[PDB]
Each structure stands twice: as structure tokens, then as C-alpha cells.
Structure 1
Amino acid sequence: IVGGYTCGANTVPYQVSLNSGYHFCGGSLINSQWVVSAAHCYKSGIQVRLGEDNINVVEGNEQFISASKSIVHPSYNSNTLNNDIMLIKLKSAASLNSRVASISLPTSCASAGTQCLISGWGNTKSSGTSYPDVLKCLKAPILSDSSCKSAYPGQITSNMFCAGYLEGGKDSCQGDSGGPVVCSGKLQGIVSWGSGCAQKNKPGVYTKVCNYVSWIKQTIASN
């Protein structure tokens, strides 16, 4: 997260870190056994880390649970990043509490102008490289489809939305991939892609989660 703030320990209780020897992606806990992340975060050997603040220190509220199964969206295209969504099932159910909690799926799509919370352990610099170890947060509005398409000609599908600031300076970045965009207590987005981070007229692009609720529910119900 570039131009954000320190969230505070366990204040984003649905935020997970995906770990394969190291943090490589964010995710969102949507029930005791399932995490939603980005399809481009797919790899084998995933351990889901819940209750994290400092990802380099065991602080006492963590639950480390290995993934039993990953399900990338059937229509995910890695070139265009269309349908950039995946589900990860935990080998055992997480113990839910105030610091480890699921986030609600949307019942309807959020509109341009809606304020959201974006979070993650990604790069905090737009030019250099500095990785924080505590969770960073950014409050950011959803942008109009028209401004999103104008920022990224030929690249924005019906399964994507822009959020952030056209002036630059505040954005998600490398390492935030797969993490949450939550608006009014609903998971509306997944950190997906962008051109650099926090660059003028290049806001972050996010997977439009409301399009996938039926797929998520049915997949969970049979897996």
C-alpha cells in the first residue's frame, strides 16, 4: 500500500497472508474454511496465515492453516487478468473470534463514489522498494467505469473496477495482490492489477467480486 496508514493490529480481521516460505499475496476470509484471493496468486504449497499484524513476528493471535485445495476461476485469463479470482480451502476450519473473522460477500454491486478500505503488506513506495511488516490500510473511493476505461483504454472488462485517486500518491502495490477491497462491510473487490503504483491517472484495478457470488457460493457448497 502506497500513501496509506498503519491499520493497527488485527483491526482488519478478515485479512489473510498467503505464505509459501514468505508472504506473497493477500486474501480475504469469507467463512471458517474458505479464503478468496486473486487467480494470479495461484501456486502450490500455500499456507494461510490468519490473525496477522507483523508478518515477521509471532505476536500471539495467529492461526497458520495449510490449504487443502485451490480453485482458480474456470474463465481466468492470465494475459488479460479477466476473472482474476480464486478460492482456497483450509485443511481445518479457522477458530473465529474478534481478531479472526469472515467478511460478508456482497448482495449487490457497489457504485462509483462508494468509500472502501484496501489493505495489505505490499510495497509502500511508488518508485523505490520498501516492504512493511505490519498491515497497511488505504481508504479509497470506487471510480466511475468511464474514468476507469479512460485511464486504461482496451483493458477494463465488466469484471473489473478502478478504485483510488487519479492524482496519484495513494494506491495498492506489489505484494497487496489478492487482498481485500471492503466497502460498507462487504467484500466488493480483490487487489488485481495496475500500471505501476500510485501513478497519476493510473489507479488500481480490482476484481469485481459481486459478479462471482453465485460461483463462490456454489463452489463452496460442493467442495
Structure 2
Amino acid sequence: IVGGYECKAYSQPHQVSLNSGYHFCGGSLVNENWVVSAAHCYKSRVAVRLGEHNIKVTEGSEQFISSSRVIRHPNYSSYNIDNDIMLIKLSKPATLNTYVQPVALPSSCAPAGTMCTVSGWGNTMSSTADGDKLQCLNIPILSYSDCNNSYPGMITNAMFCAGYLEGGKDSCQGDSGGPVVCNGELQGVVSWGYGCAEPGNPGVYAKVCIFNDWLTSTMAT
């Protein structure tokens, strides 16, 4: 997260860290048994770290749970990072408490202008922001016109841009798979962008609201 601030500890209880020897992606707990992440964050097996704030220090609020199923969306296509969404099933249910709480899926899609929050332990591109401590950033959803203008013909029905065309504030490498919460529900998954916080290159996120049927279907299976 570039241009953001350190989140109040545990203010994003759905935020998880995907670990395979080190932190490589974010994710969002959507219930006691499932985590929503990006398909480009795929790995046959991953460690899901919940209840984290400082991923480098043991705080006692953590729960480390290994995945038992990792399912990339069937229409995921890496060449254009389309349908970049993935479900991770926990081998054992997470214990819901003060530090671990699921985020609700969207009842409907959020329109351009909606102010949301994105968080993660990714690159901060700043000597002041400590990526080891969960970073938070408020970003507004951009209009399709501005999104497509930034990346001509590269925006699909499964994507939306959020952030500032002026640069300085955006998600980044390491935040991938993480959440974009708008008014309490999960509208996006950190997916891609040219660089980070670069003028004219806003963040692109997987549009969670159109994946409800697949999400609920799969989690029941």
C-alpha cells in the first residue's frame, strides 16, 4: 500500500496473509471456512495467517491455518489477468473472535464515486510507511470511462479501477489478493496495474459483485 496509513490494529479482521515461507499475497475471510483472494496468487498449498497486524512479530492474535483446497476461477485467464479471483478453503475452521471476523460479500455492485478501503502488507514505496504493519488506504471507485482511458481495451466486465489518476496513493505488489471494502462489504480484490501509484495508472481490481453465484456455489461444494 503506497500513500496510505497504518491501519488501526485489527480494524480489518477479514484481512489474511498468504504465506509460503514469507508473505506473498493478501486475502479476505468470507466465513469460518473460506478465503477470497486473487487467482494470480495461486499455489497448490498455502498457509493462511489470520488475526495479523505485524506479520513480523508474534502478537498472540494470530491463527495459522493451512489450506485444504485452492480453487482458481474457471474462467481465469493470465494473459490479461481477467477473472482474477480465487477461493481458498481452510483445512480447519477459523475461530471467530476479536481478531478474526469475516467480511460480507456484496449485495450488489458499487458505482463509480464510492469511497472504499483497501489494505495489505505490500510494497509502500516509502521510507516512512512500514509495510510490516497492515496498511490502509481510502480509494474511490473510478468511472469505466476513466478506467478504460487509462488502459485502452484492457478492462473487462470482471474489473473496475479504484484510486487516484493523480498518483501517490494505490495498492501494490504484495497487496495482491487483498480486500477492497466499500461500506462494509467486499467489492474488490487487489489484482493489477502498471507500476504503483503512478499518474494515469490507477489500481485495477477484480469485481467481486459479479462472482456471487460462483462464490456461493463453490463454497457450498
Gaps of 5+ in 2: none
Q: Displacement, 1:60?
A: 0.7
| RMSD between superposed Cα atoms in Å | 1.2
Does residue 14 in structure 1 map to residue 26 in structure 2? Answer: no
Partner of 1:207: 206
d(CA) in 2 for partners of 1:65 and 1:213?
A: 25
Q: The residue matched to 1:116 in structure 2 has which SS?
A: strand
d(CA) in 1 for partners of 2:14 and 2:205?
A: 18
Equivalent pair of 2:188/2:207 in contact (CA under 8 Å): yes
Equivalent pair of 2:45/2:68 in contact (CA under 8 Å): no
Does residue 188 in structure 1 map to residue 184 in structure 2? Answer: no
1:144 aligned partner, one-letter code: S
Within a 5 Å distance, the mapping from 1:31-50 to structure 2 comes to: 31-50=31-50
Does residue 171 in structure 1 map to residue 170 in structure 2? Answer: yes
Equivalent pair of 1:33/1:94 in contact (CA under 8 Å): yes
Count of aligned pairs between the two proteins: 220
Q: Displacement, 1:45?
A: 2.8
How does the TM-score come out when normalised to structure 1? 0.97
Partner of 1:66: 66
Within a 5 Å distance, the mapping from 1:14-163 to structure 2 comes to: 14-125=14-125, 132-163=131-162
Distance 1:20 1:131, change over 3 A: farther
Q: Displacement, 1:69?
A: 0.6
Equivalent pair of 2:168/2:197 in contact (CA under 8 Å): yes
Q: Displacement, 1:99?
A: 1.5
Q: The residue matched to 1:216 in structure 2 has which SS?
A: helix
Q: Displacement, 1:131?
A: 6.3
Question: Which string of whole-angstrom CA distances, capped at 9 and with x for unpartnered residues, describes residues 18-72 of structure 1?
Answer: 0001000000000001000000000133000000001011101000000001010
Q: Displacement, 1:8?
A: 2.0
Higher mean C-alpha displacement, 5-14 vs 188-197: 5-14
Equivalent pair of 1:122/1:131 in contact (CA under 8 Å): no
2:137 aligned partner, one-letter code: L
d(CA) in 1 for partners of 2:139 and 2:219?
A: 30
d(CA) in 2 for partners of 1:134 and 1:44?
A: 27
d(CA) in 2 for partners of 1:45 and 1:187?
A: 24
1:179 aligned partner, one-letter code: G
